[PDB]
Each structure stands twice: as C-alpha cells, then as structure tokens.
Amino acid sequence: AVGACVLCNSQTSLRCGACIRRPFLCCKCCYDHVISTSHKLVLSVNPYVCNAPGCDVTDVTQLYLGGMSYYCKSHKPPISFPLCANGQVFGLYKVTDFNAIATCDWTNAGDYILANTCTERLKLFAAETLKATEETFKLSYGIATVREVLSDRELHLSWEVGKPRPPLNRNYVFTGYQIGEYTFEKDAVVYRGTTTYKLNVGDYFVLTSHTVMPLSAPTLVPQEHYVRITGLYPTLNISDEFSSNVANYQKVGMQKYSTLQGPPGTGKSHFAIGLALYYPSARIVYTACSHAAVDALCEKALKYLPIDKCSRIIPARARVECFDKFKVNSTLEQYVFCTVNALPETTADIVVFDEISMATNYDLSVVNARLRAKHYVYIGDPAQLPAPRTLLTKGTLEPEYFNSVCRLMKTIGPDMFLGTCRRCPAEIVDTVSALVYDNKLKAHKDKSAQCFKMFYKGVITHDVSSAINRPQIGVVREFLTRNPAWRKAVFISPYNSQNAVASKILGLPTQTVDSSQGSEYDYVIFTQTTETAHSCNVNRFNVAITRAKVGILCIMSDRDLYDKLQFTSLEI
Ligand SMILES: c1csc(-c2ncc[nH]2)c1
Numbered sequence: 001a002v003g004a005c006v007l008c009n010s011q012t013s014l015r016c017g018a019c020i021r022r023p024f025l026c027c028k029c030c031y032d033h034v035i036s037t038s039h040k041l042v043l044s045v046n047p048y049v050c051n052a053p054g055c056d057v058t059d060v061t062q063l064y065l066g067g068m069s070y071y072c073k074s075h076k077p078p079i080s081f082p083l084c085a086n087g088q089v090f091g092l093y094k095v096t097d098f099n100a101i102a103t104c105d106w107t108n109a110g111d112y113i114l115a116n117t118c119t120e121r122l123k124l125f126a127a128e129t130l131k132a133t134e135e136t137f138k139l140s141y142g143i144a145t146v147r148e149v150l151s152d153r154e155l156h157l158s159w160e161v162g163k164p165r166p167p168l169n170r171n172y173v174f175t176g177y178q179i180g181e182y183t184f185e186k187d188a189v190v191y192r193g194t195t196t197y198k199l200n201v202g203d204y205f206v207l208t209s210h211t212v213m214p215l216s217a218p219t220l221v222p223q224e225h226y227v228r229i230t231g232l233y234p235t236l237n238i239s240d241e242f243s244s245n246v247a248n249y250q251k252v253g254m255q256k257y258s259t260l261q262g263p264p265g266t267g268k269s270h271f272a273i274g275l276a277l278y279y280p281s282a283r284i285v286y287t288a289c290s291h292a293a294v295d296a297l298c299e300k301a302l303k304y305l306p307i308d309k310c311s312r313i314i315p316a317r318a319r320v321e322c323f324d325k326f327k328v329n330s331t332l333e334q335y336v337f338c339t340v341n342a343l344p345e346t347t348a349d350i351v352v353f354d355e356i357s358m359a360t361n362y363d364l365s366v367v368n369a370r371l372r373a374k375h376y377v378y379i380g381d382p383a384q385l386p387a388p389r390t391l392l393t394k395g396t397l398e399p400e401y402f403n404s405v406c407r408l409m410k411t412i413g414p415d416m417f418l419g420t421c422r423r424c425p426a427e428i429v430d431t432v433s434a435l436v437y438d439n440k441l442k443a444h445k446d447k448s449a450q451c452f453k454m455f456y457k458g459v460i461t462h463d464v465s466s467a468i469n470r471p472q473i474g475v476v477r478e479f480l481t482r483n484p485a486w487r488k489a490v491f492i493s494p495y496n497s498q499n500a501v502a503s504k505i506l507g508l509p510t511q512t513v514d515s516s517q518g519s520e521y522d523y524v525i526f527t528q529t530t531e532t533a534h535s536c537n538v539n540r541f542n543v544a545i546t547r548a549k550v551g552i553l554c555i556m557s558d559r560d561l562y563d564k565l566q567f568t569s570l571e572i
Pocket residue numbers: 531532533534536558
C-alpha cells in the first residue's frame with residue numbers, strides 16, 4: 001500500500017477501490033475521480049468504510065474521520081472532518097481522460113483511441129485495465145466437456161447451458177483438462193489439439209485466463225538522438241546484399257529507438273538480419289508477438305547468421321510446433337529469437353521488435369520491462385492487421401491507434417520506410433500503393449498478367465456469425481477447370497467457415513487473411529465472401545492481395561474495392 005499517483009506521481013496512501021486495477025490516486029486526483037465517476041470506494045491503510053457495526057456506508061463523500069476511525073453522517077462523532085472537502089480526499093502527504101479509462105467496458109473503439117491519446121502513465125493504466133477486463137471476460141464463457149469421438153480429427157462437446165458459448169474458429173485457444181491447448185473449427189466439429197491425446201468422454205477445456213501483471217516500463221522509452229553511433233561497432237566490409245540499408249543501420253545506432261514501415265515484401269526480415277551483419281559484435285534479441293513471426297526471423301538468420309550463436313527461446317509449456325534448428329533455451333547466445341510472452345530477464349545491444357502492427361501497448365511495455373537495451377528497432381506496417389481486440393464490438397480501430405509505435409508512424413511518419421516491393425506483380429503493388437501507402441510503394445516486379453478480379457456477390461450464408469458464400473467457391477471451381485496452373489493456389493478469405501467449405505469443395509490449402517499475414521505464395525485465390533466492415537477493411541484487403549508472388553484471383557462482393565483492384569476483369 002505504499003506508492004505514487006498515476007496522474008501526477010504525488011505520493012499517497014489512497015488507491016481507488018472501485019478501479020479493476022486499484023491505482024494510486026493523490027488527494028486532489030482521488031477527489032476529482034470520486035466526484036466525477038460512480039467510483040466511490042477509496043482504499044489506503046484501511047478502506048474508507050463506516051466502522052460502526054453493520055453500517056454499509058462505503059461512499060467517501062458520505063464519510064468522515066472521528067478520532068482515528070471512519071464513520072458516515074449517521075455514525076460520526078461531533079469532532080469529525082468530512083473525507084471529501086476542499087478538492088481533496090483525506091490522505092497521507094496532502095483527469096477527465098483517467099475517468100473514462102477507469103470506467104469504460106472496452107467494447108467501443110473510442111475506448112482504444114483514448115488508451116493511445118493519453119499521457120504515458122495513462123497508456124499503462126489503460127493497457128493494464130484493458131488486459132484485466134479481457135481476462136475477467138474469459139470466465140464469463142461456459143465450460144465444455146467431451147460427449148464422443150468420431151475420428152482422429154472430428155468430435156462433439158457438451159456445453160454448460162446458460163453461460164454464453166465462445167466463438168468457434170482459430171482465434172480462441174482453450175486449455176484442455178491438463179491435456180494441452182486446443183482449438184475448434186465447425187453437427188461434426190473439428191478438434192485441433194496442440195497435444196495428441198484421445199480426448200476421452202469426460203475431459204473438459206477452458207479459455208486460459210493467464211493473470212495480468214502490473215505494468216512498470218513505458219510503451220516507448222524516452223527518445224534520444226545521438227550525433228554518432230553509440231555502443232555498436234559497424235563494419236566497412238558489409239556485403240553489397242545489405243548495402244541498401246547501410247544509411248538506415250547508421251540511423252539505428254544514432255537513436256535510442258527507431259521505426260521502420262515495411263509494406264509487404266519490401267525486405268523487413270532482410271533489414272532485421274542484415275542489421276546483425278552491420279554491427280557484428282552486437283548482441284541482438286529478435287522479438288515479436290507470435291511464434292510464426294519469431295520463426296520467420298529464425299529462417300532469415302539461418303541463411304546469414306552463424307547457427308552456433310543462435311538460440312530459439314521456447315516457453316516451458318510447449319503450445320504448438322516452432323523452430324527446431326537453433327540451440328533451444330540458451331539465454332546467453334549472441335542472437336536470441338523469442339516471443340514477447342516468453343522473454344526472459346536480460347539485456348542487449350539492440351532489440352528488434354518485428355510485426356509491430358500486431359503488438360498491443362501491454363506488449364510494448366513488457367518488452368521495455370524484460371529487456372534493457374542500447375537500441376530498440378520496431379519493424380512493421382500500420383497498413384497491415386492489428387492484434388484482434390476481443391472485447392471491441394462497436395466502431396473500427398484505425399491504424400494510428402494500434403499501439404504507440406503505430407501512432408507515431410501514422411502522425412509524424414516512420415523513421416525509415418522500405419519503398420520497393422519485391423514480392424508482388426505490379427498489379428498488386430500498384431493497387432495497395434494507392435489504397436494504403438499514398439502512392440509511395442514501388443513495384444520491383446513487372447505486371448504478371450495473372451491478376452484477375454470478378455465482381456460476384458453470390459449468396460451469403462451464416463455458420464452462426466462466420467460467413468459462407470458457396471456461389472463464390474463455385475465460381476473458383478469453374479475457374480480452376482479452365483486454369484489448371486491455379487491448382488497450386490492457396491485459398492484465402494476473411495472467414496474460417498468459407499475456408500472450410502472451400503477446403504472440401506476445391507481441395508486447395510486454406511488460410512484466413514489474418515493467418516496469411518507474413519506469408520507468401522505463388523498463387524492466391526481470394527473470395528471476399530460478404531460486404532461487411534470485416535471483409536471490407538483496407539488493412540485486411542491489403543494483406544490478402546499482397547500474399548501472391550505470381551498471380552491472384554479476387555472474387556469480390558464490394559464494388560469499391562473491386563473497382564480499386566488494378567487487375568484484369570474476368571467473366572461469368
Ligand atoms: C458495416 C459497417 S461499415 C460496413 C462497410 N464498410 C465498407 C463496406 N461495408 C459494413
């Protein structure tokens with residue numbers, strides 16, 4: 001119970017007992033909090049509650065100090081001061097934005113906008129409160145048990161009736177019972193158990209409500225501009241291969257932190273691994289939110305960096321399969337590849353945080369608390385997909401509000417920008433350059449002449465809320481008979497249910513737009529499925545079409561995005 005205020009750091013014994021995170025509030029700030037919100041419980045050494053037997057008065061405005069104890073107006077002695085008077089709540093060592101974070105339910109977009117526009121301490125308070133809320137909301141869902149086993153990939157479950165049923169897709173990871181993490185995709189549902197055990201009739205699962213740990217470090221450390229490279233030792237031999245990034249690697253050694261906007265296939269991984277070849281003595285920790293992003297950095301380092309100084313830090317409880325080729329869990333190796341949630345207590349010359357659009361302010365803070373570094377490099381693209389905000393249902397979260405790093409890239413601009421897309425045919429590069437990069441993304445490849453668009457709204461059917469468009473899958477089928485070279489294509493769509501129908505009918509490997517991020521394929525077949533805000537989202541549209549290296553077929557529902565696609569229009 002000893003500490004400083006979240007709004008001005010003025011020392012106090014006062015905490016708000018109504019806040020889900022019980023923040024320390026000073027005498028003036030605690031008052032301006034209780035008088036403006038429904039939050040009336042004030043904690044300190046002892047809570048502010050009437051001491052008189054059986055008295056349930058807990059509002060600090062209806063309370064007074066009688067001698068050494070606290071009492072309401074019905075119990076107070078003649079010599080008693082009200083706890084609320086003269087803009088202060090009585091406490092030791094004797095704003096609008098804080099109120100809104102402390103009381104919001106996180107279902108509105110404006111709640112996240114504010115969690116990013118506020119001061120740095122209010123950013124941590126909001127990040128902590130939001131994560132606590134998201135975890136307490138996980139309990140609100142019911143417990144599901146095994147009813148029977150059809151085969152090695154199909155089953156049926158008993159639900160606790162009453163308490164809501166959480167959504168069935170590859171976005172909700174259950175913790176079976178201690179039979180490893182599990183995922184679900186739709187009466188015969190499919191079980192994607194991260195561990196191979198015969199799911200006995202009687203075992204049950206639950207959404208892992210991993211507890212929220214208070215935030216110490218800021219989302220972004222204070223910026224420092226240096227006039228010479230600091231604590232890093234460059235080379236004058238750096239291979240031609242990484243010479244396009246030499247002026248940027250120098251900017252990296254001349255700032256405490258630096259931002260890199262890298263559109264799809266502009267060489268983000270190349271930049272990250274090449275930074276190690278530019279400062280060859282530097283100890284570098286490569287971090288990202290997902291195991292897939294960490295693994296993609298593992299793959300690029302396997303080609304250019306010495307395997308003996310590499311290590312893939314894997315969490316004790318192995319969820320799904322990750323990197324196998326590096327010396328596992330060696331914390332003192334020069335190059336360490338580990339996810340934000342598995343980051344051990346250590347220091348580094350440079351920390352590279354890749355896929356920055358997927359990072360939350362909580363993630364930004366964790367990295368700053370578990371890693372003390374000379375240089376921090378954030379690589380990503382605010383034009384790509386952000387972390388799914390489960391509680392958010394009203395309003396769309398704009399890129400300047402994804403996190404503090406995205407916020408900078410969208411207002412002041414990124415420190416560095418990779419302007420040449422080497423992956424996509426010019427039809428795709430030109431489309432997304434106009435759509436999300438203000439015509440600053442350039443095509444390295446020529447037009448492949450294999451980028452097609454078909455405007456076909458079809459028939460939207462719903463598998464609960466996840467959507468299906470069978471006429472769009474049927475249009476893909478007719479196209480595949482006439483274009484057998486498209487037999488190697490990946491079927492992408494914004495919905496899992498669409499992907500499941502297309503997996504059975506077309507037989508193509510499947511992918512949601514969100515899971516396609518970071519990956520590339522020669523041929524991509526995208527069916528838009530619906531014209532919802534989800535399927536029409538420009539960051540999602542951008543990721544979807546920028547997966548193709550050679551050609552893409554887009555079956556569109558929205559006329560806007562269809563007309564924007566600089567592709568050859570097909571017929572039927
Ligand atoms: C629902 C809310 S906005 C929306 C939309 N935006 C673009 C196309 N459809 C659908």
